[model samples]
Target: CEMKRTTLDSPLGKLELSGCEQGLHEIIFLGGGPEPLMQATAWLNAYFHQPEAIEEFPVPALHHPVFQQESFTRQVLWKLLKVVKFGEVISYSHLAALAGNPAATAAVKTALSGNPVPILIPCHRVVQGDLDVGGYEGGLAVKEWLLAHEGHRLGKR
Candidate 1:
């Protein structure tokens, strides 16, 4: 399929989007170039600021080899989407168990590390076992911003 690119200004920074008729294929944060980035910017402008659900926005299938299986990884991501509620979080270990890979905490992290789309999939909602914010592809600052935007708070232990 022919690749389409777009860019948008996010709370974290500029984001670059790439996709085809299938859906939004890739979302890149802090993309270095101008053309691709501009394309994403336009799409995001319509998605983010608008007062409507962004779920309808088409996210193209990930073509990465790691996600090629589309069963475990995709299922895990789908479960993650279900488990993560707005203003809430779950530990990586918990997510691993939820995905039916109780002993694969590390693998769960590895899968998320390769996440092609970030906020769209709500990957930032997965954190450390101790309720601490974890690593994000877009960086910790962006992760924190997303959590804050969702009205999530790290309570005092």
Candidate 2:
């Protein structure tokens, strides 16, 4: 089947959900699917309204090629998805160590930048060594909001 798409309105902005028969491929913040992965919408709804209940809502199976590759980026992203939790943040260097490459902090940044599933993988939870919110593809504002939503208090920068 061809790729399916859908959209959802959120406090952050419009979110685009994209996927196909394989599995969920990406969740992006665009300011903008197939019956299109209604499961994802449900999971997202819980993520927004009930962050504490997310474990009950399993993340849909991933079907993206990036997730399939046997690379450091894949390892980093996968680790991020499973190890990092809501309201919790990891430093770039710390995340690199988790991926088994203590010196690959830069590589960890690159992996996060290319993460296909942003919110689901929780890339926004990654921060600077000093705990700065850091850059987000969805924008720093969205990252800050997400952090706040998860109850991780931080002085607005």
Candidate 3:
């Protein structure tokens, strides 16, 4: 399938969108330069308007130099995707446990913070351990908007 390239302004910042002939392959947060941006746009056009496939795609964690490499990050991301359930919320601590790294709360937070594909990966579904709406890299307002958009309500503690 032929690929196309494009850029969109997201709440987080400028997003580089990419996809295969099948569908949107990647939505990178900080596409490094014009070449990366062009590549992302092409991919996004190819996969335009398709539902994201977070579980099926290989989410590269080493795309950014600032992000620390950790073995469990991918596992944690997959676990988060599995537990999301479309409109449910889960705590970060719970996700850490599910990822088989119970003591890695800080690591979990870091990984989540660096998530390049936020909406696709459903990082907004993860909250604080105490059940409060937690910090969101895309901003708290965007988080609130996403939860509401998904028909999720914060339950009483």
Candidate 4:
């Protein structure tokens, strides 16, 4: 199958979803596109209503990077998905540490900045060491709102 794109409306704004037969890929904040956001939002709603039911919705497989130029990009995305926890937050440095490399912060940060294919993959879960919310490729406001939505309550919470 070829790479595809679709759109959806969200409180955050319009979002786009893109991917191929391999699996569901990116969920842009009104920035990327619907079943993509549907499942994701359904779960998000459930998360607010019943945090335990959050797992009722399954996250689709993410597309690997389009190009393999930055070899670490793939690794960073994969490790980010594996290590980032829901309703939890960690610093970029700490996320890198959990990603199997002490300096994961650098590579992972770059991969995320490039916008890999993973719907609500949890990039929002990564933060500054001071419990500070950092920049989100999609939007900084979206990040703060997401962290609050997750009720992340990490070190500060």
Best by lDDT: 2
Cα lDDT computed for each candidate against the true fold = 0.66, 0.82, 0.62, 0.62
* Candidate 1 residue runs with Cα over 4 Å from true position: 31-68, 155-157
Candidate 1: TM-score? 0.75
What TM-score goes with each of the models? 0.75, 0.90, 0.61, 0.73
Clash numbers, per candidate: 10, 3, 13, 9
Candidate 2 lands at a TM-score of: 0.90
Residues forming the 10-long window of minimal summed lDDT in candidate 2:
31-40
Which 10 consecutive residues of model 1 have the lowest summed lDDT? 31-40
Better of 2 and 3 by lDDT: 2
After superposition, the stretches of candidate 2 with alpha carbons farther than 4 Å from their true spots are 32-36, 155-157
Clashing residue pairs in candidate 1 (N, C-alpha, C atoms within 3 angstroms): 6-39, 6-40, 7-37, 7-38, 7-39, 7-40, 7-41, 8-40, 8-41, 24-60
lDDT tens per residue, model 3, 1-157? 3554456764346776654434444566672323444434432332223324323333332233222345688777767756676568888888899989888888999988766556756788899955488888877887877677556775321
Query: lDDT at 108 for candidate 2?
Result: 92
Residue-wise C-alpha lDDT for candidate 1, range 106-142, written one tens digit per residue: 8888878867767766788899856578787767877
